[PDB]
Design a protein around this ligand. Sequence first.
Ligand SMILES: [Cu+2]
Ligand SMILES: [Cu+2]
Ligand SMILES: [Cu+2]
Ligand SMILES: [Cu+2]
Lengths: 128, 128, 128, 128
Amino acid sequence: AECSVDIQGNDQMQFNTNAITVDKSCKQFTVNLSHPGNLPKNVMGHNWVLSTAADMQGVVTDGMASGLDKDYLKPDDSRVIAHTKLIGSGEKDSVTFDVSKLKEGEQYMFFCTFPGHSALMKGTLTLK
Amino acid sequence: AECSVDIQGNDQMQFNTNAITVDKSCKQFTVNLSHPGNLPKNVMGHNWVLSTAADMQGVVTDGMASGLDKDYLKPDDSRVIAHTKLIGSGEKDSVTFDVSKLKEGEQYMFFCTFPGHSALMKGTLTLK
Amino acid sequence: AECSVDIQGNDQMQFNTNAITVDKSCKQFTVNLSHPGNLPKNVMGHNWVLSTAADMQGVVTDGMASGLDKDYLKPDDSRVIAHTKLIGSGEKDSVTFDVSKLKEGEQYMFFCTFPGHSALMKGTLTLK
Amino acid sequence: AECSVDIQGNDQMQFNTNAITVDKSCKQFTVNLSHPGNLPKNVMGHNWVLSTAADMQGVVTDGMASGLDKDYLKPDDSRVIAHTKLIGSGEKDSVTFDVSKLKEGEQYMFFCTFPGHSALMKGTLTLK
Ligand SMILES: [Cu+2]
Ligand SMILES: [Cu+2]
Ligand SMILES: [Cu+2]
Ligand SMILES: [Cu+2]
């Protein structure tokens, strides 16, 4: 949609899109995440996390180490550009971030940091 | 598209959708598969294969065993409802099948049978 | 050894093997499962479950529905040939079963029924 | 064991381990890689490549771009601490490296650079 995308994380550990395009004319961009299905957060929680492609692994390893109560993200992690909370089925969360935080010609990855989901739940974000 | 869907399998071993719905009014249904990216067929080939969810695993296992030359599909496998060829980047292939081969209230799965790909490249198909 | 195998299911949602061959001369066969890592059972619990390839999807689907208190396995599911308990990190469990429950020529699959894990935590077992 | 590890990458695009610990008493560490299965190098080749977690993305991407003739690794990449050859099934390779090139407190990752494989063929290495 205009400077926003709606994305779903389902009970089969899948995001419904795997490529996000942000137009340079946008001052801000909003991601609206929902979780179709019936499984709870401790079993199939999902969040949408954005970092550069280079930082994804560091973000994922340290997130796993933060625990369920920390939504599997290291608090005040400097490499995370934007993120939602970790949501279970039937819940919703959105994030709006400034497009000035993205740079031309840098590769960005969005992903879910719940233990073991990033191998399957990830995609590219591109500023065009 | 009425009675068709276009789907893409990319260089990250991802399909761009995880759910196809077929309209019960469609007599036939076509799937148009393309492969964006730059990797060749032997490294990142993708096909779209349809079966019941209960048959998916035996089709994938026997497909692997048939190998390279057989497009990683057992020839005349009775469990395969429809399938494309295995394609590399920049190639395109379509498959049309009779919608009468599908039951309402039965669960179907589409997937790619290139070794290792079905872990990520799979989705549901249902009649509506 | 000869009629046993040690399997590990780790925090990355993977088993350390994807194929087990049971030697025809074994009267019984043992699977010893351990869980390297640090995550608790409610987030990354693993079990080793055996059925035929054709039954795997039914077992995983009824399993997921039965929930964590039932170790994500349908109570007294007749499609389950043998299974361990669902274990958390630092736990271990073993199951010994009679090899006469297996026949030559049938495809068997082993897998984890914790939601989402069978996508990666699956393998073939064959009586040879 | 202690200063060596045997690792295998199979036809299901998986390593048999996703965590290696190198003991600080080791002067040198040896990794022996084998490829179980039947698939050739150009379809499912594997290598074991070590770098810091922050450098892994860059190594994988430039590795992809170097091609099969370069074993999917950029020639003389200074980010690669150690690596094997790319091997097909039934092949094996060994690599020894100096443990003094590893510092305590730095996050390292080992992985495969054959296109697409690092998503699942990766793990941690830690000085302990
Ligand atoms: Cu998730
Ligand atoms: Cu594929
Ligand atoms: Cu599991
Ligand atoms: Cu590989």
